[PDB]
Amino acid sequence: MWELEKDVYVVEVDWTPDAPGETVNLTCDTPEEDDITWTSDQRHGVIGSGKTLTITVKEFLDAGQYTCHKGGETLSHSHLLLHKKENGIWSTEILKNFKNKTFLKCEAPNYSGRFTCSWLVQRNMDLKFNIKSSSSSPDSRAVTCGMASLSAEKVTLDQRDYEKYSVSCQEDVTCPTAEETLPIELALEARQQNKYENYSTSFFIRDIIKPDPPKNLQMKPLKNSQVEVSWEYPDSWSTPHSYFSLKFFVRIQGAFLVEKTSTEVQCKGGNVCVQAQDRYYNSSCSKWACVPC
Amino acid sequence: DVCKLGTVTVQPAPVIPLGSAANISCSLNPKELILLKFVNDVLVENLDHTGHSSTFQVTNLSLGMTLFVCKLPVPVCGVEISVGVAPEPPQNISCVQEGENGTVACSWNSGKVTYLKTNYTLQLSGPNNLTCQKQCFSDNRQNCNRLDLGINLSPDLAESRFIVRVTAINDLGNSSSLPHTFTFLDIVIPLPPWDIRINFLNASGSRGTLQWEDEGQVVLNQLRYQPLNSTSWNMVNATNAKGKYDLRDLRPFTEYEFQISSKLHLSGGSWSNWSESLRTRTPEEEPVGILDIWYMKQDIDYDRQQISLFWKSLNPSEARGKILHYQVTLQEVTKKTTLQNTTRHTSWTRVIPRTGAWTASVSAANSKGASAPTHINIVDLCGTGLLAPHQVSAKSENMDNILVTWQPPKKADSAVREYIVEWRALQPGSITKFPPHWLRIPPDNMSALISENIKPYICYEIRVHALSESQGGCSSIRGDSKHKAPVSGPHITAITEKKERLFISWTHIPFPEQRGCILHYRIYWKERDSTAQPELCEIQYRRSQNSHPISSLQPRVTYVLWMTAVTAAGESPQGNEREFCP
Amino acid sequence: RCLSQSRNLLKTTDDMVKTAREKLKHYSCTDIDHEDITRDQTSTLKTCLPLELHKNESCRGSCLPPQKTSLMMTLCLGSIYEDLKMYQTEFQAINAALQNHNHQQIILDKGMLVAIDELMQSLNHPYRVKMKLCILLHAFSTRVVTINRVMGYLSS
Amino acid sequence: LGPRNLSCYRVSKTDYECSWQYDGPEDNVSHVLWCCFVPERCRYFSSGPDRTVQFWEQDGIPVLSKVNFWVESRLGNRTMKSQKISQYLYNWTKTTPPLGHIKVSQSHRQLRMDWNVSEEAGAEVQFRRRMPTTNWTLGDCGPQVNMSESCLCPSENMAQEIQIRRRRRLSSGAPGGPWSDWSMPVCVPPEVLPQAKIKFLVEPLNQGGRRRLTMQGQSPQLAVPEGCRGRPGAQVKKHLVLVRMLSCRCQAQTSKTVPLGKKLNLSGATYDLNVLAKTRFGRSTIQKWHLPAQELTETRALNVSVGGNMTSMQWAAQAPGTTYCLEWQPWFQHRNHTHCTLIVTHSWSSKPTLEQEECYRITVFASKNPKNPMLWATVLSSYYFGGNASRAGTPRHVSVRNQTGDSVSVEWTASQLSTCPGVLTQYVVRCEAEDGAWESEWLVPPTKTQVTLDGLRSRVMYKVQVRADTARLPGAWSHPQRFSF
Numbered sequence A: 001m002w003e004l005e006k007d008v009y010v011v012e013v014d015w016t017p018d019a020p021g022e023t024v025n026l027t028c029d030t031p032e033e034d035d036i037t038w039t040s041d042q043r044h045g046v047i048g049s050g051k052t053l054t055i056t057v058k059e060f061l062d063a064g065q066y067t068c069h070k071g072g073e074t075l076s077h078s079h080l081l082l083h084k085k086e087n088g089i090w091s092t093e094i095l096k097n098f099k100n101k102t103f104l105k106c107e108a109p110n111y112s113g114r115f116t117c118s119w120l121v122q123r124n125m126d127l128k129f130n131i132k133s134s135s136s137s138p139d140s141r142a143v144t145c146g147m148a149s150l151s152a153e154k155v156t157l158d159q160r161d162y163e164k165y166s167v168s169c170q171e172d173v174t175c176p177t178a179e180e181t182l183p184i185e186l187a188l189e190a191r192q193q194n195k196y197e198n199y200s201t202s203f204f205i206r207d208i209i210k211p212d213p214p215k216n217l218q219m220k221p222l223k224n225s226q227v228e229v230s231w232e233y234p235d236s237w238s239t240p241h242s243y244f245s246l247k248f249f250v251r252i253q254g255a256f257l258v259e260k261t262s263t264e265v266q267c268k269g270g271n272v273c274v275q276a277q278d279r280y281y282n283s284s285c286s287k288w289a290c291v292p293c
Numbered sequence B: 001d002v003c004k005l006g007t008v009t010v011q012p013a014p015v016i017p018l019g020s021a022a023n024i025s026c027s028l029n030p031k032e033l034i035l036l037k038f039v040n041d042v043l044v045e046n047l048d049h050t051g052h053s054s055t056f057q058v059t060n061l062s063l064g065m066t067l068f069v070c071k072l073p074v075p076v077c078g079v080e081i082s083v084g085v086a087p088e089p090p091q092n093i094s095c096v097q098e099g100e101n102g103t104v105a106c107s108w109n110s111g112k113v114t115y116l117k118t119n120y121t122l123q124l125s126g127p128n129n130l131t132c133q134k135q136c137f138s139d140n141r142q143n144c145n146r147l148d149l150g151i152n153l154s155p156d157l158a159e160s161r162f163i164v165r166v167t168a169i170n171d172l173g174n175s176s177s178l179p180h181t182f183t184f185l186d187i188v189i190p191l192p193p194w195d196i197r198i199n200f201l202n203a204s205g206s207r208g209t210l211q212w213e214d215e216g217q218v219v220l221n222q223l224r225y226q227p228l229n230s231t232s233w234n235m236v237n238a239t240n241a242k243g244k245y246d247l248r249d250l251r252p253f254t255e256y257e258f259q260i261s262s263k264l265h266l267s268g269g270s271w272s273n274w275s276e277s278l279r280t281r282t283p284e285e286e287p288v289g290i291l292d293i294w295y296m297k298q299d300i301d302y303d304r305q306q307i308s309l310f311w312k313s314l315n316p317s318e319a320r321g322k323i324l325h326y327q328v329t330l331q332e333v334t335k336k337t338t339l340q341n342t343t344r345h346t347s348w349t350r351v352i353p354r355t356g357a358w359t360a361s362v363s364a365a366n367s368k369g370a371s372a373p374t375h376i377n378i379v380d381l382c383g384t385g386l387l388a389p390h391q392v393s394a395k396s397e398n399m400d401n402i403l404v405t406w407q408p409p410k411k412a413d414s415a416v417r418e419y420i421v422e423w424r425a426l427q428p429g430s431i432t433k434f435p436p437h438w439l440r441i442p443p444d445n446m447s448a449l450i451s452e453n454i455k456p457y458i459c460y461e462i463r464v465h466a467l468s469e470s471q472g473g474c475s476s477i478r479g480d481s482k483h484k485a486p487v488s489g490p491h492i493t494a495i496t497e498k499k500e501r502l503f504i505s506w507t508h509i510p511f512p513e514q515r516g517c518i519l520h521y522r523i524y525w526k527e528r529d530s531t532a533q534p535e536l537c538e539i540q541y542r543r544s545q546n547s548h549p550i551s552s553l554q555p556r557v558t559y560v561l562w563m564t565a566v567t568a569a570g571e572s573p574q575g576n577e578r579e580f581c582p
Numbered sequence C: 001r002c003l004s005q006s007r008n009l010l011k012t013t014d015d016m017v018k019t020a021r022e023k024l025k026h027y028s029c030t031d032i033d034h035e036d037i038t039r040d041q042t043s044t045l046k047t048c049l050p051l052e053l054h055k056n057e058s059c060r061g062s063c064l065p066p067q068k069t070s071l072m073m074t075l076c077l078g079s080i081y082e083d084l085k086m087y088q089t090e091f092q093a094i095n096a097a098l099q100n101h102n103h104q105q106i107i108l109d110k111g112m113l114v115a116i117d118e119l120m121q122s123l124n125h126p127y128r129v130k131m132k133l134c135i136l137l138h139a140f141s142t143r144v145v146t147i148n149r150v151m152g153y154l155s156s
Numbered sequence D: 001l002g003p004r005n006l007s008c009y010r011v012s013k014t015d016y017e018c019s020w021q022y023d024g025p026e027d028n029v030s031h032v033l034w035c036c037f038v039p040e041r042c043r044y045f046s047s048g049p050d051r052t053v054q055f056w057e058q059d060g061i062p063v064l065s066k067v068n069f070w071v072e073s074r075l076g077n078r079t080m081k082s083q084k085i086s087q088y089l090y091n092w093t094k095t096t097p098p099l100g101h102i103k104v105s106q107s108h109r110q111l112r113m114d115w116n117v118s119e120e121a122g123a124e125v126q127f128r129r130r131m132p133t134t135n136w137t138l139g140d141c142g143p144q145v146n147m148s149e150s151c152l153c154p155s156e157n158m159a160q161e162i163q164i165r166r167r168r169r170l171s172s173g174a175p176g177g178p179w180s181d182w183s184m185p186v187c188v189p190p191e192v193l194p195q196a197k198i199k200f201l202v203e204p205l206n207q208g209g210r211r212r213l214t215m216q217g218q219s220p221q222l223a224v225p226e227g228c229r230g231r232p233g234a235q236v237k238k239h240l241v242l243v244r245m246l247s248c249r250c251q252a253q254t255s256k257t258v259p260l261g262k263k264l265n266l267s268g269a270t271y272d273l274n275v276l277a278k279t280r281f282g283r284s285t286i287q288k289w290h291l292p293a294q295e296l297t298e299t300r301a302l303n304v305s306v307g308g309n310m311t312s313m314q315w316a317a318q319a320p321g322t323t324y325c326l327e328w329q330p331w332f333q334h335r336n337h338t339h340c341t342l343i344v345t346h347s348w349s350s351k352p353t354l355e356q357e358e359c360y361r362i363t364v365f366a367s368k369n370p371k372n373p374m375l376w377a378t379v380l381s382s383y384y385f386g387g388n389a390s391r392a393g394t395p396r397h398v399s400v401r402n403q404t405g406d407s408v409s410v411e412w413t414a415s416q417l418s419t420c421p422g423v424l425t426q427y428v429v430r431c432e433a434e435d436g437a438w439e440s441e442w443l444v445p446p447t448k449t450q451v452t453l454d455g456l457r458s459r460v461m462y463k464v465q466v467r468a469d470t471a472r473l474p475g476a477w478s479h480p481q482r483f484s485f
């Protein structure tokens, strides 16, 4: 029942068969007062007389483009969305949840203050989006990030392909700190051509960070069929590597964790592969880097 | 604080009596409310103007402590509630004191557990204005069913009647006990004495002296002494022994355990716990029994005949103690002659001329000394057949038992005064390493039942002699307890023909082949082409026999010879074969 | 060094928070209710930064190595000391109050308390109780993580 | 004729559908679906051949008001229409099949299928299963408790196809939606695998003491329904074999799992071969093969030293430094007491196990790794006779029969050493006259039980004696036999 932006209103309808819709009033943004024509794009013919038209909304037939008009000149218009609601819980059919029953998966590569937030849309017929930091207090942490971009990744869940939209966001503080006390909270505004959806998320960027696979892996040949496997810290990871440090999982193809940059192991007939996790938290681990024995 | 969403309040208190009900009121800061009750941290219980202040009544609180969480789902606050009872009035109040130098402690029964932290106080009062008091905290971890008071009042002043009281306090309701009284003349439990030693005197294991050091006020004492033969302990009482006692009628050369308990007064005080068990070794004693000595008469020659010396001791009454020396004396009765020797073992051999009578004696010399010289008058090994008894019948109902019955001889049984029965094994030649084993049976008893030093499936030889000082009787026969079928038969070794008689000679079939007493042999001979029943000759077994004659057969016709060894319980199968054409 | 003691402190604090999560699961110890004990001398979270991560510069000791001497990082060490002081004081208070009642479901193992004590030696010189312990742990875990980070960067 | 059985409904949360069946030829059909209502307002959809038009919520269709659907089919110069239908579209919901991989668990005559479904509400569940050679059969799943759902099936002996479907049952215990479509097929294998006779090739071990086993590549086929591919219900996932050596048990247990059809080096020992097949539940069953032991023809030297409280055996091993295993098996008895060691000589204490008068098998194995069967080398499995063999080697029942006027024949039953290979070597028979003027010896192979003495002088008494000989000690003579002619 509220105004989303200049000359566009979003209302709510109780998505249930035996309940009645809401009543809204629309005024033509014109000081001239007389009998006027109102018309939509969902139906033909004049629908409203007078500058102030009262219309009831209970269905997606009742929403859209409402224009106040006379003669050959267009006076003004307004745009009317909806917002599905069932049993007091809002209905979210624009985005599809991941394997983890969550909607927005945000991930960062390091501690620079930057991340990317990906979600799984279900169709592509006229989707519009928005990212903003839903901050209440003046002390709440603020992101300053922009436009969403489609990503060519088509990921398969339940034997069906869904398209990953992504956004590349960057947090900012006037001067850095050592740790994060207030979480980053983000509000998403999905919209399919009339339908409106609000999504939310909240996270510290220390429990989502995902490192990169090791870049320079080599396998030095030793006596008694033993081998020296070596890697390196990824360059995208933060600096210095003494204040921020990793913890590599090593497996041969049950895995063993190390903190040095070289290891003694022996092969079995396949590959040897390492990961790169953050040593403190259970922040998610990178992808493997391998050499074939 | 932490309950930033409001508060929770209880009525009447977080501590309640058993089975009651409690009002719980949740209040929210101005501008659904569920209750979570958990039993021992286990979920078993579950469920705006009214939500600003919501009151509930809770009953049926189980035995223990439980948590109510008032959750608006986000939590608001909570309170930890506990249930309990007032302590039971204690019962069975007792107190303990340890000897002349020992403080007073006490013990009591607290009864039921309140599942809550309680405490107890212990008041001691007594005449001449003596008093003391200490407390103890009993909770979910530590239990106070005993306490020490820590004051050592004088036990010599035993003319006071003192008062013990124990009182229980908790958060819910106090409780008390009976104002118990105790007579101080019997509150003291004496400590066990020390320096309990055993001194050996009178050169006899029955006599000893037992010493100990204790308080000189002790009037009653008891001693426990016993050997290791039985778990029963011999008790003895004593009044005013004053640290020393004498012990008579003790089994000699027997290890003993010694324990002691004290008592200060016949009508006062209490007994004493037994001290450490003392292991004491009783010295030796001189045996007074008589050991029989057995002999043999093997005739090397008329003037150099062999006499054996055998004995066996198997009871700790004739060879008790560290016995090492055996002085053996052989005396001639007809003429004054004797021979002496020193032996360490149970067997000996001697060479004596056959002329003259004999008396054989041996001593039993332990560390204490030599026992009575065991002597036996000796007659000839085998005498006349007039006093020789009839055929002794041996019956074996067990694999390790033979019952032998000897009929009285044709001579009257008044002459015989003692019967000697000896068993031994058999060998192809002469045996001296294995001793013959003996027993004694009076003539008045009918039979003899031997169940020792006997092994089934070996043929043994028994002998019985009627012992007389002039000329005893002698008889012997062979037998075994249990025998089975022999595994095979011996060999027809040598064959000869002479003076119209055909002689067959063999050797001695070894010991494991018999598996008992071999009783006879059966020799079967026939013709080579004769498939009918072979004709048979019977040989009764004799140990000295190794050859057998047979009559003349058909000349110029070949004959086949074989044999079997037959006992009572079985028959040996066919052995080797012989072919002979006379 | 303080580095190995700090690793020991992290390991024992992780063990304790594991025990608290296992035991006080019915209690609010999951969500976060993230608030820390200290707010005035909070220069732990502002000064304990490396050299090349200063973008605006406006905002004695034994484990400060001579190879990495600075006129800034001493403030980080002092703030670590004061935070450890407050944490040990209220942890001693919660441990003392934990045994005045008959609940023995959570027992603070003295490993982290002796680790804090040795760290102090090295650096310088009802139902509300369970909730206060829980929030103290939920802030102390990230505080010991920060202290490990800064000790590893400084000493090495 | 014409269109019939119109049915529109809702699929997923934000999409709708309609379907109808035609009676008559479909050569040049065209179908139009007319949907309309009053708020009069009408709309048409054209599909042509296809019969699965979709109209999601923002296609200007009403989904919260009564609408009337009908279908018109256009053929040549003729139109025909089906029945009207009036219904809502929001609660006439078609529910999806159980999405994702549905888990199957096995038990005795039990197949338990568990699945997760997106909507937490419980729903009615039906199944339909097909045998490899028959048509389908139906079956209800009955009430369940719910998040997830569970269902049962009796496990048949061979493989079978099974399919599942649902329906969102209304709260009043009524059918509140159309039937769902079947999920993807679940093919389940036989509960017990009927094993076929696979082939093995026997090979005598070489001079070095190695035999070779190369399993052939063969496998039977299981008859399965049409849809059984890509899953272990069609064929078994993998074949395997398990080799076990029951000869040197002195170390820990070491059984080796090998893929079927590869070369393997095996010793001269008793082996157990298991042929197993891992299905989607686990290891199905076992095909048994028993390998008896063989021995190298090359006799090799061995030295022994027994007596007192000390026992040892010495030889010349190929190389020290590697762990060996020695085993003792008295061949003559039932091998009640087991005795082996895991350690060139070995020293140990004497016990009443190796001191009797029966033949012992001593087997020596050289080992390098207790994880594989290839590094166990057959050093020697030899036969020995402990104790005084001279007493046991004495022949029994020596019989002499006159053949001619100058020759006789001596025959005897074989000694205890004859049945024991590798120890008995020779029979020595001594013929000597009693006057001492003639002594002679005859040598007899151990495989002959008789001998003939020729050239014997007449009317002279002769004594004859027999013994048995071995490779280390002579034998005592028998009972002498006296004869004359």
Ligand SMILES: *[C@@H]1O[C@H](CO)[C@@H](O[C@@H]2O[C@H](CO)[C@@H](O[C@@H]3O[C@H](CO)[C@@H](O)[C@H](O[C@H]4O[C@H](CO)[C@@H](O)[C@H](O)[C@@H]4O)[C@@H]3O)[C@H](O)[C@H]2NC(C)=O)[C@H](O)[C@H]1NC(C)=O
Residues within 6 Å of the ligand: A001, A002, A003, A090, A134, A187, A197, A198
């Ligand atoms: C995401 O979507 C949710 C919907 O689930 C949305 O919550 C809605 O927010 C709007 C605006 O924040 C609410 O509309 C308000 O309603 C209250 C009382 O109902 C009014 O007082 C408000 O009046 C405003 O507008 C007037 C006219 O312009 C002004 O005169 C006045 O001063 C106010 O500015 C306003 O109409 C709406 O009620 C909720 N829906 C609920 C509570 O169910 C949420 O805001 C969206 N965004 C985010 C970031 O979550």
Ligand SMILES: *[C@@H]1O[C@H](CO)[C@@H](O)[C@H](O)[C@H]1NC(C)=O
Residues within 6 Å of the ligand: B011, B012, B021, B022, B023, B057
């Ligand atoms: C609880 O409150 C009711 C009324 O407020 C009162 O009657 C009752 O006695 C109270 N119970 C307790 C245990 O205080």
Ligand SMILES: *[C@@H]1O[C@H](CO)[C@@H](O)[C@H](O)[C@H]1NC(C)=O
Residues within 6 Å of the ligand: B173, B174
């Ligand atoms: C015991 O408790 C009752 C309860 O009021 C009190 O009146 C009394 O004084 C108490 N007595 C003692 C000895 O504590």
Ligand SMILES: *[C@@H]1O[C@H](CO)[C@@H](O)[C@H](O)[C@H]1NC(C)=O
Residues within 6 Å of the ligand: A017, A018, D087, D088, D091, D092, D176
């Ligand atoms: C759906 O909801 C409407 C609401 O009026 C009700 O009449 C109808 O029975 C429900 N069920 C179906 C199958 O239409």
Ligand SMILES: *[C@@H]1O[C@H](CO)[C@@H](O)[C@H](O)[C@H]1NC(C)=O
Residues within 6 Å of the ligand: D102, D103, D114, D115, D116, D148
């Ligand atoms: C269903 O989801 C649960 C999550 O609780 C998971 O443990 C299980 O593996 C899933 N799959 C099933 C039951 O087939």
Ligand SMILES: *[C@@H]1O[C@H](CO)[C@@H](O)[C@H](O)[C@H]1NC(C)=O
Residues within 6 Å of the ligand: D388, D390, D391, D476
């Ligand atoms: C074996 O027995 C024979 C016959 O008694 C004997 O002569 C020989 O010495 C014995 N040898 C051993 C080693 O016991």
